[PDB]
Structure 1
Amino acid sequence: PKLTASVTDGAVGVTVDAPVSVTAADGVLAAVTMVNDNGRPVAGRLSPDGLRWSTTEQLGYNRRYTLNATALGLGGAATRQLTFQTSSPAHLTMPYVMPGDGEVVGVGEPVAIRFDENIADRGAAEKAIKITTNPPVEGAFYWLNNREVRWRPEHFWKPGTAVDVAVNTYGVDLGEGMFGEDNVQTHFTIGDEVIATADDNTKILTVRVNGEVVKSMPTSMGKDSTPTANGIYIVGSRYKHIIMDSSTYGVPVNSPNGYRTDVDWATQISYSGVFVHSAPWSVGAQGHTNTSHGCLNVSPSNAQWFYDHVKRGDIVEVVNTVGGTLPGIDGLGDWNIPWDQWRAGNA
């Protein structure tokens, strides 16, 4: 009878991203036990036909295990002992995915994987991220910085699409001895198409649901001094009220363009600090003149309507302002990068 392990006796550097197995050939598996360096049994299952056995729980880094298996066929008996050592990472990194599990989002919500460390080997990271879509659509990876990678289609998601994201980084060398701290797996669905548009020509924020106008909001955006970049913004988090602090976006409150205001019904559409919010002090200007540092000022009535009917992932498109274009790597500006450049990636 012949025995076969998925590991070699004195091996060093056993990844641990996959389980350990043993197969019997011209016979059956009569006994299999794996134990770690400090003596505890690892736990595993033996298939019903008794031909294959595999560990059933997560194996650990910096571990020294030893396998003892015996196969006994009609002919005779065979036994082997193997002791190996798993990967001992130099450092550990944890990934966080967005959006949340079971969430329903807008058609512009990209898949997000953020590591709490810089990733030396992006290919290894990407390769370890499995994305399923239904109906299937072509998508690609692209890094916003050294820690966050994002995945999205060429055009906005088609409503009803299911997105499944499995980040199987546990046991994977993500570069320079950087190993995944664990796995994570979110799943979400794409809802109604909600595209709001802010035209600096009319200074109105038009909200379109499935191509139909359902709201027109007078608005005052950033003033010439500090305009609102034109472009496609992806709706992020929504707040019933929030103290906006310019220092959060790099501008000292005490500075000229600095500020700190407690506003209501605020929906964030830019990491640079742009929000669609209630601005009762400028309702006068709303619809006629820009007076903000960049945010889309709207009446308190419209900001709340916006908070109740807009979801993360929906889109806000700004056009014709005196500002430039929202940066592709902003954090919610993903759609401003040409598909051509995005699909090619930067791994």
Structure 2
Amino acid sequence: LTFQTSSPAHLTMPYVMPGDGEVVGVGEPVAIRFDENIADRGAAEKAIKITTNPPVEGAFYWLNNREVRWRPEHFWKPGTAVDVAVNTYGVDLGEGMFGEDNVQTHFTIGDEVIATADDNTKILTVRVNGEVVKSMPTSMGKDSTPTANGIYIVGSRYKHIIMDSSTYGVPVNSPNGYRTDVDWATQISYSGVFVHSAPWSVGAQGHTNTSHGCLNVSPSNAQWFYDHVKRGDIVEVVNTVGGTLPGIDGLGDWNIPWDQWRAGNAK
């Protein structure tokens, strides 16, 4: 260990996901987010060593100037072990900004869990290692506020959460504002798409889209989803009238074509 002198106004710390020792789904990218913008992305990439077992080819792609992602071309093979060494201590990351410390994470890939929300049937079907285990009626985004098609990575889950218009700039007492209690909410996009309990749309679920974009399901089915899906599992939306989820959403990584992802956006 060689010591590096430092200043609190020229240091940046990396933060790695997923957590050390976690079991995650086949869609989980390695994520390294810095608490500062990174001027020299190539220097950050050269300081990060990702190794996998069984070994698979992967590559870095930056979602923005703060966070880089690493993933293979296809979903992970279940049982894969992944080691992440972020060896940024003392590294010159550009513009007088230096890496504050090293971080090391290890994680493993669990079962393959892919839930397909098909707008033609209004059914969300969960497959585990290829086998259907659950079929849930759903109501997705109305035509004016559709659910985007594409591959979504499961993120955080909440027993209870408040959806509040103030966060998008719309006061609660506006014609378009809302303050909504939601149970059993599984996040699948940073943009705000959740699978969640929607008692108010149970008659439409399986029939017609009435949501602002979220995947409405019954209270019991939402609780089931909360219990059985984990960070890194996949939700694929198909056949809606929306476009495609943006690749740099935060959970939209798999919608970027591999040739573009692998080419990267550092150098």
Q: Specify the TM-score bucket, using the shorter chain as the normaliser.
A: over 0.9
Do the aligned partners of residues 210 and 340 (structure 1) sit closer, same or farther apart at CA in structure 2, a change above 3 Å counting?
Answer: same
Q: How far has the Cα of 1:89 moved from its partner?
A: 8.3
Distance 2:172 2:184 in 1: 22
Q: Is the 8 A contact 1:108 1:314 kept in 2?
A: yes
Distance 1:101 1:285 in 2: 41
Q: How far has the Cα of 1:258 moved from its partner?
A: 3.9
Distance 2:175 2:62 in 1: 33
CA deviation vs aligned residue, 1:271-306 (integer Å, no higher than 9, x gap): 000000000111011111111111000000100000
Q: Is the 8 A contact 1:157 1:190 kept in 2?
A: yes
**1:229 paired residue among 148, 158, 169:** 148
Q: Larger relative CO (CA 8 A, sep 6+): 1 or 2? A: 2
Q: Is the 8 A contact 2:153 2:231 kept in 1?
A: yes
Q: What residue in structure 2 maps to residue 284 of structure 1?
A: 203
Do the aligned partners of residues 196 and 84 (structure 1) sit closer, same or farther apart at CA in structure 2, a change above 3 Å counting?
Answer: closer
Distance 2:33 2:71 in 1: 15
Could you say what secondary structure the match of 1:125 adopts? helix
Distance 1:213 1:170 in 2: 46
Distance 2:115 2:52 in 1: 26
Q: Is the 8 A contact 2:4 2:90 kept in 1?
A: no
Q: How far has the Cα of 1:142 moved from its partner?
A: 0.4
* Consecutive aligned runs of 4 or more in structure 1 exceeding 3 Å deviation: 82-90, 246-258
Give % identity. Answer: 100
Distance 1:333 1:256 in 2: 31
* Unaligned segments of structure 1, at least 5 residues: 1-81
Q: Is the 8 A contact 1:89 1:179 kept in 2?
A: no
Do the aligned partners of residues 84 and 143 (structure 1) sit closer, same or farther apart at CA in structure 2, a change above 3 Å counting?
Answer: closer
Q: How far has the Cα of 1:84 moved from its partner?
A: 12
Q: How far has the Cα of 1:94 moved from its partner?
A: 1.1
Do the aligned partners of residues 314 and 84 (structure 1) sit closer, same or farther apart at CA in structure 2, a change above 3 Å counting?
Answer: closer
Q: What residue in structure 2 maps to residue 138 of structure 1?
A: 57
Larger mean Cα displacement after TM superposition, 145-154 or 254-263: 254-263
CA deviation vs aligned residue, 1:166-210 (integer Å, no higher than 9, x gap): 111111110011011111111110000000000110000000000
Q: What residue in structure 1 maps to residue 37 of structure 2?
A: 118
Q: How far has the Cα of 1:260 moved from its partner?
A: 2.3
Q: What residue in structure 1 maps to residue 119 of structure 2?
A: 200
Distance 1:111 1:170 in 2: 19
Q: Aligned pair 1:258/2:182, yes or no?
A: no
Q: Rg bigger for which structure?
A: 1
Distance 1:179 1:230 in 2: 40
Distance 2:175 2:140 in 1: 18
TM-score, normalised relative to structure 2: 0.95
Q: Is the 8 A contact 1:268 1:275 kept in 2?
A: yes
How many matched pairs? 266
Q: RMSD in angstroms over aligned alpha carbons?
A: 2.2
Distance 1:336 1:204 in 2: 22
* Unaligned segments of structure 2, at least 5 residues: none
Distance 1:246 1:342 in 2: 34
Do the aligned partners of residues 179 and 281 (structure 1) sit closer, same or farther apart at CA in structure 2, a change above 3 Å counting?
Answer: same
Q: Is the 8 A contact 1:249 1:273 kept in 2?
A: no
Do the aligned partners of residues 280 and 142 (structure 1) sit closer, same or farther apart at CA in structure 2, a change above 3 Å counting?
Answer: same
Could you say what secondary structure the match of 1:286 adopts? coil
